Design a protein around this ligand. Sequence first.
Ligand SMILES: Nc1ncnc2c1ncn2[C@@H]1O[C@H](COP(=O)(O)OP(=O)(O)O)[C@@H](O)[C@H]1O
Ligand SMILES: Nc1ncnc2c1ncn2[C@@H]1O[C@H](COP(=O)(O)OP(=O)(O)O)[C@@H](O)[C@H]1O
Ligand SMILES: [Mg+2]
Ligand SMILES: [Mg+2]
Ligand SMILES: [Zn+2]
Lengths: 611, 632
Amino acid sequence: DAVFGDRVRRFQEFLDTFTSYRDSVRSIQVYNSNNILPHRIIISLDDLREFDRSFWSGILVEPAYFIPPAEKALTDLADSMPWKLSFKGSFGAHALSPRTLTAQHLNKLVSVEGIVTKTSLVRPKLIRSVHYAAKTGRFHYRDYTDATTTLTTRIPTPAIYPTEDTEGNKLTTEYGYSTFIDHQRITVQEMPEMAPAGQLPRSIDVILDDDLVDKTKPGDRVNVVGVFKSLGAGGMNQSNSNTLIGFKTLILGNTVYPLHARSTGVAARQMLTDFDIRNINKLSKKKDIFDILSQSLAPSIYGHDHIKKAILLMLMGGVEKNLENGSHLRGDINILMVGDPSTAKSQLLRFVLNTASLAIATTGRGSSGVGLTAAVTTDRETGERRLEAGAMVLADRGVVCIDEFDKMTDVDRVAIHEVMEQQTVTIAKAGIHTTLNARCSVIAAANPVFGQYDVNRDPHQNIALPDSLLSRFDLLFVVTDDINEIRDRSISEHVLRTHRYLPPGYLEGEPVRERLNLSLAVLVTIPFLRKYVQYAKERVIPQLTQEAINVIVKNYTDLRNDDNTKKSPITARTLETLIRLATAHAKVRLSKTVNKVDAKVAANLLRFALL
Amino acid sequence: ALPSIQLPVDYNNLFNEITDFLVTFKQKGPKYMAMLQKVANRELNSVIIDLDDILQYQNEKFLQGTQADDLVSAIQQNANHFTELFCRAIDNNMPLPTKEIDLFPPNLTRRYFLYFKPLSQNCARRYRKKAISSKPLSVRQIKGDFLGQLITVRGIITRVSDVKPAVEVIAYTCDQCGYEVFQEVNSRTFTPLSECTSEECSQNQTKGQLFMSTRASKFSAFQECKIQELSQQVPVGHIPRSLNIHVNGTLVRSLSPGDIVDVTGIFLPAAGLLTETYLEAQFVRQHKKKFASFSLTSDVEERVMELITSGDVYNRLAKSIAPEIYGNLDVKKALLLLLVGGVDKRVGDGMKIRGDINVCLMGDPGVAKSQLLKAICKISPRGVYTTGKGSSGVGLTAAVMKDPVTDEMILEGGALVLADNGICCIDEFDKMDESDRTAIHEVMEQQTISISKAGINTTLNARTSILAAANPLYGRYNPRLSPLDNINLPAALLSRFDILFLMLDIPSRDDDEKLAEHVTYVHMHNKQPDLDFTPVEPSKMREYIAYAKTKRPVMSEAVNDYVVQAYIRLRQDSKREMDSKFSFGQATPRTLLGIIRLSQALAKLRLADMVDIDDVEEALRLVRVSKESLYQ
DNA sequence: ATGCATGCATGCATGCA
DNA sequence: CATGCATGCATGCATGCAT
Ligand SMILES: Nc1ncnc2c1ncn2[C@@H]1O[C@H](COP(=O)(O)OP(=O)(O)O)[C@@H](O)[C@H]1O
Ligand SMILES: Nc1ncnc2c1ncn2[C@@H]1O[C@H](COP(=O)(O)OP(=O)(O)O)[C@@H](O)[C@H]1O
Ligand SMILES: [Mg+2]
Ligand SMILES: [Mg+2]
Ligand SMILES: [Zn+2]
């Protein structure tokens, strides 16, 4: 009875010392004085460790006797100037996974990372029930509670819905004046990247409510911070129930974070500071910007300067349109490479898979054409025939990297025609008729039909793809391994230079260590490239101008009536391609007008790709 | 136990304002008194309350200066309680049948259904009162905070049940004492009464047995529906969700599968504290009016008159289909004739002939075939869009399924049954399996489907018009090969089309500049270039085509003689080419029927009861120009 | 004239209620 | 666990083209 108040005081003086969280109280409060933000604050456990070790160890080891006091202190501060708490920072040995969670950790605050495997349907929960009595003309109210509402244990109460007033007057429900709170239950499993091969994985349930009720979707990588609890009685109460059962366990979540990985739905994100923005703006002034940002892509590969420029343009992307009637004009860029063996194709696909904010990788004969377009007519537990998302659906607003693209059969290639140009997946099969969004872009690699590019034969004899498919690819590049003497000396020296490199903080001969990269979502280094791309894509939308209009219309007309031979046919789509590329370049310069240089660069790039 | 709390509401003043509104409001005498007079006189089974009327009434009373209450806000927050308040007032001000006819719970006496109509947005802006009931919301934006309120949901209907009886007030009778007992029901299941509870039976030692009386009970009409989200509302990378709807009273049969709608209702709750939810429908609003619901009201006549008197209507209405696509004037004309259609014909004997037009577009890559099927699926009021790959044949015709609401087993229909009385636009026609196209033949010709698999031995009805898109055998066109072999459709399937356009892309330095300028203008400005042409909006165009579809022109003999001569000419001219193997096929009677149908449709678009001869001339010109690219 | 490759059509495996 | 329908994957056969 007295420890509670002492703990309340100790958290009040903890808030008093560190004034950051005080600031973040006026913040979600002055703004609710005209989306109401939710009253949840986040505290760093490192600060709480450096302030008071005993209180820190209590939260980590004995949450049920330390958290409610902190919540009461926080509510008191807010009212003086309820509010709930979330925790971030180091967790020591408490940071576990579904495989390593044992009975030793029950009734402790833990953080668990894994893959979200099964979500539920959000439902409301009754928390206060109001009633009206017309005979007396008065309002009454009842309250309810359950085990999973508070951390401490409270004697069960006899939940009963009132129907008659003490005087006998009949009551009627006032559904609009009652209180309801949302509730979801999810399942977390051990990630495939960490689970041992050939062994069945382990799972754990998590319960979320209120403002944490819908923040992740199945198949995502998640990190949940909450209390590991026990409920019920494993036959103990019963005189004779069984001797082979135990108590039921679950996690009362209070924080959920989505983690970004490779070939996963969640998209990476960084927090941009004033320093980052200033540096980006300063860097964008230099005239060689398109070359600085372009030679820094895969700097361990020699040459391919134009494929690298195309990669950067695809990363930046153009601007799409939506007319009033309801028309849609594509705004993405797609790339195809056809090449000889050992021309650094799969090593550029993997670079894109590793540097793009969201990308999914797929091979050729590997994934069928229903696994890409989401034809997952399946059934759920409720019984509703549902479509399960696919590679191109999950990659909405992302990229798809296709390796061995020539091995994909026609029955599988024809499913991608709609996605590459209409940017939708309309599935109509027994009992189901729906349309999903697939606004993705594609980068694909392939090799000739003869093993190597035969220069004597016509391009159609080598590439061997339909013109329908070839039109949808914006840029098609041909790469050849021609044996030289001057070039071989340079490419050997470069390769041998790469193979002699020591990471900082290592001793020559010491093996290097590898780790998995699970970041927390929300020449120049790679991080700066990501920051630059994010800023440019999120805060720039250029507009066409007459000069670009003239350059594009001249180039298109000249290309259509030509006596040359092209690796791909020329249609109306090419015009749009010229408009896209131009816009992308204007996006790289952080300009709001597609100037003439943009159009000229687009023309040069397309002409190199074709001729 | 059961403490008390204080609230600002007052269910006494509001009932008085309810009566004042209901017997003192005028837009003829009082507005709602007349509606009650119709109800008494047995001409109206439904009374509807417009919240705009209440808002205006209270605004006028504020102008009077006398204090009042915010009735509309009270209804918006707690709407399931005001239904009975209004019913009570309506039962105390009803008149007596001026015409002639040929204690107990109050609902046995009532014969009328009360519905609330949301508060408009224009009225809100007129009187500065942001409206919560007229803000469309997705199935994903409806959370616990909205339980008990009056809201609207925008979506697409997926499944609908069959109207069934639902008992609201069971009645019983006692053969021993003769009393009547009434039981109210507000749950999915119930337990009936067994032994008599009257004064006499109570006093006596022999208590009688009660019996349910079906005729005396208050049976209502119940239906249930499911609504999903539109693809424009789902977030990035998610899957759309669904929601349930209950319909009771005189709204049944107002929702059909596949219709995009705005539905207003009350969000009400249904061992645990968790609860299921549902929307009690109060008012439906369709985004595209069905053609077979048209009436020549004064307003619609005024609107159609301007189009009629504006000279060129055929070109105005053909240039207005996808005004962002340059050229393709004849294609757009044949697609405008697709919407109207011919005139079906029953010969009085056991024979019938269709009246719908089927169209096909075969062309080279990048000629905007798909973007015209996506505009035609949007202009039509009941349009469907499907792609050749994403189809199964069954997925187009039908299969079996079981109804959760009732216990009946039902047959589910595909895209060609959803598009009934509409266009079923099929893209990538060539790439779907030939064993899947063969189910389209019967739909094209007899407008029916015949299923003889297990469990089901029956027929369906599909009055659909097919707009198909396809490509040549090897991508681009090959001038060396014959026109017939270049395409890959059997002769039987070709004959069933009435228009088959060949949109070949032949570069030419002069006309490509025009296309480039049009497209790049469409991108710099978000609208189309021409400043002399003002396209007719989709609503005004749908309204004109609906007016046109009511005609049924006939033909004279002076046109019959021309039709026969043209048919003989074509059917003789065709054999030479067909034998020569540079051709498209061989003319058959279906060509004659297609010419007749195209003439009828052109006659209808002119609002005429007779088919002129300039219509059989326009029809022949279209059928000729259909192939005037192969003769470049 | 023979062999190889590609496309199509027939078969099976799943999944179901 | 047998019956029969709809999806999706796999295989073997036939035809065409090239050497
Ligand atoms: N231009 C190049 N510069 C540096 N290394 C290269 C270059 N081309 C090929 N390599 C090396 O040769 C190997 C070829 O592997 P890969 O990229 O898979 O070939 P492919 O072109 O068939 O995809 C890679 O490991 C890569 O390091
Ligand atoms: N005549 C035209 N006018 C305007 N845009 C056109 C025209 N022809 C082609 N396009 C453009 O080219 C694209 C062709 O896409 P799509 O409709 O898929 O062609 P198809 O279906 O014939 O393969 C469209 O996005 C359209 O904007
Ligand atoms: Mg490779
Ligand atoms: Mg197309
Ligand atoms: Zn009795």
